[PDB]
Design a protein around this ligand. Structure first.
Ligand SMILES: *[C@H](S)C(=O)c1cccc(C(=O)OC(C)(C)C)c1
Ligand SMILES: *[C@H](S)C(=O)c1cccc(C(=O)OC(C)(C)C)c1
Lengths: 302, 302
């Protein structure tokens, strides 16, 4: 019993974090086999940041300009190259702690664990979701860029996020491990801002199923709805449309609880229209949208 | 920016988790140096559980009755003994991954990270608080007992909790690493239940300071209060009394934000009396009490 925002165990990623320094800039890097991945911003200076030409900045560097430290061990850089917004530093040592891994890009509405790091040292681990507007509501301080987000499946780490920056509303933007940004953001100084966001409907319904599995049933009702009537209500409350694929994905949780997906939708409609009347669900007084159907099944089953 | 329920990186504890089997019962154990720690319930059978005499149960066992597996490696048990509600299995191999560690017992209102494990394999990591009534609101399924809770400071793991059982309200009870239960709970079958709980006032005030550090200021006011007037209001809302030591502990956050502790108390009084009027603090619509002043400083500073 119980339901918590649970992250993956972080040890496999801890053994990959290193510190990268270029000039006076230090940030985190990810050491896998004999390559260290880090934000290419490490080669910028403070006044380089209005419109840096990274190809020019990089051609003016050599290997000896990059100091890579793994714990108390310095790694010799023997090659450097750019790929989109990340830098690939080839080092003379393969990381003996490299896990099985993949570089995956995730979709809005998917969740992942973040290992927040400073100066190559892990500080904390938490769960995040990629918002519909491609930002993440992280927890990061200066020095955290290069920290990574990941999921783990049967001992294979799928890296999906590298941290780059903080937008004016305090939410966070970054890239995939190929250096391609999530969202319409750039690694230069602009007035760029998070665009409008929406609530991840399928995740809210998954979390209502978690609540039923855990004994909160007060929000259930005998009603049902059609998918189109529900989606009219969703549109009105800035919720994403629910598709038939979402309905199919909720099938296992529906079968476990005996509550048809469109019956749960009728409950969610009532909650949007009426609020909670001073009650809570799974210890929250808001509708939570950062758990996927898979997160619920992984944490709740049986 | 940002504020999340953040756990400690779990890798140092992952390298200590093993599986212990006795008869048909399997659960988790903690391998440090050449000892494996686990709940003594592992030696029970299903009908042993009304009033087991653990000293009798244990004297009928030998070393070969305990199967300890670390990954795919079997550890030979060469001694066994009981200490309160935990079992100490001496094995013929010292764990090469043992971290610097301590066994500390924590106080109600303190937080810790939990590494939930099944069959000796880590599954997820999350943050918890010891409630005033000595339960924890965890997330645990059958097979999780022996999972541990811990804090980490400068590479030293202070273990504070071993998981034993789930109470009827779905909250969790366990012991310290010396086998002594937190709270008035026993490892036998009874009608034992969580006692009445209260809200951890000093933590709520720490979290209001986190919110101010992160730009939520709507709940501030020009008022102040005395400690006695505040504590009259606390008593009325089932909040714990605030002591002068709590005020002193909040001093650094008060100095960082410029908001005197008793001024923040006046805000908390207004929030208890009026509610939030449809607003949120740090993404919550309830007053959060599971962050200590230290948690806030660690996550927010600067
Ligand atoms: C450090 S987290 C980093 O990689 C980075 C990436 C992209 C953009 C920036 C940046 O613009 O930093 C300032 C503080 C806004 C100049 C940093
Ligand atoms: C397994 S998590 C374990 O250690 C344990 C400890 C103490 C009490 C129990 C228990 O009573 O289990 C049942 C399921 C209530 C019989 C289990």
């Amino acid at each position: 019993s119980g339901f918590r925002k649970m992250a993956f165990p972080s040890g496999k990623v801890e053994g990959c974090m290193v510190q990268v320094t270029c000039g006076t800039t230090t940030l985190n890097g990810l050491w896998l086999d004999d390559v260290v991945y880090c934000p290419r911003h490490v080669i910028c200076t403070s006044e380089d940041m209005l419109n840096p030409n990274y190809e020019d900045l990089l051609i003016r560097k050599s290997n000896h300009n990059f100091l890579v430290q793994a714990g108390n061990v310095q790694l010799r850089v023997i090659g450097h190259s750019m790929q989109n917004c990340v830098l690939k530093l080839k080092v003379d040592t393969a990381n003996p702690k490299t896990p099985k891994y993949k570089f995956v890009r995730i979709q809005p509405g998917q969740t992942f664990s973040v290992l927040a790091c400073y100066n190559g040292s892990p500080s904390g681990v938490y769960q995040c979701a990629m918002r519909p507007n491609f930002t993440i509501k992280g927890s990061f301080l200066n020095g955290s860029c290069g920290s990574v987000g990941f999921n783990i499946d049967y001992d294979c780490v799928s890296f999906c996020y590298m941290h780059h920056m903080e937008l004016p509303t305090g939410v966070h933007a970054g890239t995939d491990l190929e250096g391609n940004f999530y969202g319409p953001f750039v690694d230069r100084q602009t007035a760029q801002a998070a665009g409008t966001d929406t609530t991840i409907t399928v995740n809210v319904l998954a979390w209502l199923y978690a609540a039923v599995i855990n004994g909160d049933r007060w929000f259930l009702n005998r009603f049902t709805t059609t998918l189109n009537d529900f989606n009219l209500v969703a549109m009105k409350y800035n919720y994403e449309p629910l598709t038939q694929d979402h309905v199919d994905i909720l099938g296992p949780l529906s079968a476990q609880t005996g509550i048809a997906v469109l019956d749960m939708c009728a409950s969610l409609k009532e909650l949007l229209q009426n609020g909670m009347n001073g009650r809570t669900i799974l210890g929250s007084a808001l509708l939570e949208d950062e758990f996927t159907p898979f997160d619920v099944v992984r944490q709740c089953s049986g």
